[PDB]
């Protein structure tokens, strides 16, 4: 069954751990393999793999990584994924001295928002959008990947896991301990990633839960009942939070033009209900002149 | 509980 793949190199490590670039010997196709170990005597197949596999089978989209196949033994679970050149994070690093060109960014964001809208419209939440989980090919595509943390949701949502989203990209509603979060969390992550594509550094690189809140407050200004009705009644909100004036988006991400900035603030809204949806965001004037250029790899 | 007894 692994009969037809020749491994090439390891290309990364996740929660099931080992990921290999491999080649279908008969078709030529280059695949990524996630290898999940079982050895009966545990708790069977990990919930993360159950979800990853069942949700990706439904999510067929050019801007979502394609699960090509699931291969069994009684001792090993293999996930055959379409293979992809690089992750966004390894790319931002290499653009150190050139920057990333605005139409590359614009294209990327637009594609990210498409794939995100497809997820949200199939009642799937990603819950770990970050640049390392976003893969880019040589033809100019970018795709959501790693559905390890993803989950099927309901309308209206109920309480789901709290311990959620890589810190740097976590939405203020999760940090403030809200019992209910929805699609708006993924949007918060792309907003962060947007900013990060512009400046090539993290918008909010905190070290702990409270550090991260206060970084967010220091940029967007501490929220009140005006900006975010119901904030002050949130489990983890404290009346002693320092009250910081909002800045001035022209200074949060200075190279951004007016449409750029309008978009990011819509993505970085405090109130999960005012925060723009991926669907809506595709119509934004930021995207009028968008194309799909190749990058330099 | 064992079911089909």
């Amino acid at each position: 069954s692994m009969e037809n793949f020749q491994k090439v190199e390891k290309i990364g490590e996740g929660t099931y751990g080992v990921v290999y670039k491999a080649r279908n010997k008969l078709t030529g196709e280059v695949v990524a393999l996630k290898k999940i170990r079982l050895d009966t005597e545990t708790e069977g197949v990990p919930s993360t793999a159950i979800r990853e596999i069942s949700l990706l089978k439904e999510l067929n989209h050019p801007n979502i990584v394609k699960l090509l196949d699931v291969i069994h033994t009684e001792n090993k679970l293999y996930l055959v994924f379409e293979f992809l050149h690089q992750d966004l994070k390894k790319f931002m690093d290499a653009s150190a001295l050139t920057g990333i060109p605005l139409p590359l960014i614009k294209s990327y964001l637009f594609q990210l928002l498409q794939g995100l809208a497809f997820c949200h419209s199939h009642r799937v939440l990603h819950r770990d959008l970050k640049p390392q989980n976003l893969l880019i090919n040589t033809e100019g595509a970018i795709k959501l990947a790693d559905f390890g943390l993803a989950r099927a949701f309901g309308v209206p949502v109920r309480t789901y896991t709290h311990e959620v989203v890589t810190l740097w990209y976590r939405a203020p509603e999760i940090l403030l301990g809200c019992k209910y979060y929805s699609t708006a969390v993924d949007i918060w992550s792309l907003g962060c990633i947007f900013a990060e594509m512009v400046t090539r550094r993290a918008l909010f690189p905190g070290d702990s839960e409270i550090d991260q809140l206060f970084r967010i407050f220091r940029t967007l200004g501490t929220p009140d009942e005006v900006v975010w009705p119901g904030v002050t009644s949130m489990p983890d909100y404290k009346p002693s939070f320092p009250k910081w004036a909002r800045q001035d988006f022209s200074k949060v991400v200075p190279p951004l033009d007016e449409d750029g900035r309008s978009l990011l603030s819509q993505m970085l809204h405090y109130d999960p209900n005012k925060r723009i949806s991926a669907k809506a965001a595709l119509a934004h004037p930021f995207f009028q002149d968008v194309t799909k250029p190749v990058p330099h790899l | 509980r064992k079911l089909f007894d």
């Binding site: 009966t40 005597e41 545990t42 708790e43 069977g44 197949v45 990990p46 919930s47 159950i50 979800r51 596999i53 069942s54 949700l55 089978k57 439904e58 699931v70 069994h72 009684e74 949200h120 419209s121 199939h122 009642r123 099927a152 309901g154 309308v155 209206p156 109920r158 309480t159 789901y160 896991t161 929805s182 699609t183 708006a184 999960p272 209900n273 949806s277 669907k279 | 509980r1 064992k2 079911l3 089909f4």
Partner: protein, 258 residues
């Protein structure tokens, strides 16, 4: 935020047809019957209460069992093994904190081993080819609840209740789609409590009218009248708790005027 409200409902409608079990599976099952399946679902309900599992989880597990039994012959001695893994799978998909494998072994009084439960789990995933994200009655009802004027907790809890009773009886509810059963239940709950009807806004949302629901409603209505005499009583008991506004104690309406 009803953010992707229509889209999702539309997607659930398409998926419910593809995730539908075979309506006749029980005729082709040599060693099991409708009442044995009733006995398993009843027991799965107790398991959910015992382990404080979501309602979505129980509904999901049932869908697995029926789909798995739509294609695999199972012996009386194994129907419960299938039942246990179905639940373990449901919990892993749906629950923030699923019970450990051991717990599922334990709630059988150790009929089967851990080794067998994981092997069944594997076998169940094989047969479902991992399609676990199935629309359920609980998923439709929850959206419909957004259409009430205004929110009524009794209406909700009693809808869950009836939605839940339908799980128990293959004949007839295996022939009604999740969305229709939810239709029957929501309407049935609303009328019982406030005396009112399937709202015109859900006719717009779903394309169902009282008329289209009549058949499933006729069945649901009998199931309700006869509830307290059913051989299976775990849902009724479950629905006595304050957690559900004791809705199982309310009186079924004696007529539906349709």
């Amino acid at each position: 935020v009803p953010d992707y409200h229509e889209d999702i409902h539309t997607y659930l409608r398409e998926m419910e047809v593809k995730c539908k079990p075979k309506v006749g599976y029980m005729k082709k099952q040599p060693d099991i019957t409708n009442s044995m399946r009733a006995i398993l679902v009843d027991w799965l309900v107790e398991v959910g209460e015992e382990y404080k599992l979501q309602n979505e989880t129980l509904h999901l597990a049932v869908n697995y069992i029926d789909r798995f039994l739509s294609s695999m012959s199972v012996l009386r001695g194994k129907l419960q093994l299938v039942g246990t893994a179905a639940m373990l799978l449901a919990s892993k998909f749906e629950e923030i904190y699923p019970p450990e494998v051991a717990e599922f072994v334990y709630i059988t009084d150790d009929t089967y081993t851990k080794k067998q439960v994981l092997r069944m789990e594997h076998l169940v995933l094989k047969v479902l080819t991992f399609d676990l994200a199935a629309p359920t009655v609980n998923q439709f009802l929850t959206q419909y609840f957004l259409h009430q004027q205004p929110a009524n907790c009794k209406v909700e809890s009693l809808a869950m209740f009836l939605g839940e009773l339908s799980l128990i009886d293959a004949d007839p509810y295996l022939k009604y789609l999740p969305s229709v059963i939810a239709g029957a239940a929501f309407h049935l709950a609303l009328y019982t409590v406030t005396g009112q009807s399937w709202p015109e806004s859900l006719i717009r949302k779903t394309g169902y009218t009282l008329e289209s629901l009549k058949p499933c409603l006729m069945d649901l209505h009998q199931t309700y009248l006869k509830a307290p005499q059913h051989a299976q009583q775990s849902i009724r008991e479950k629905y006595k708790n304050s957690k559900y506004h004791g809705v199982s104690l309310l009186n079924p309406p004696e007529t539906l005027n349709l």
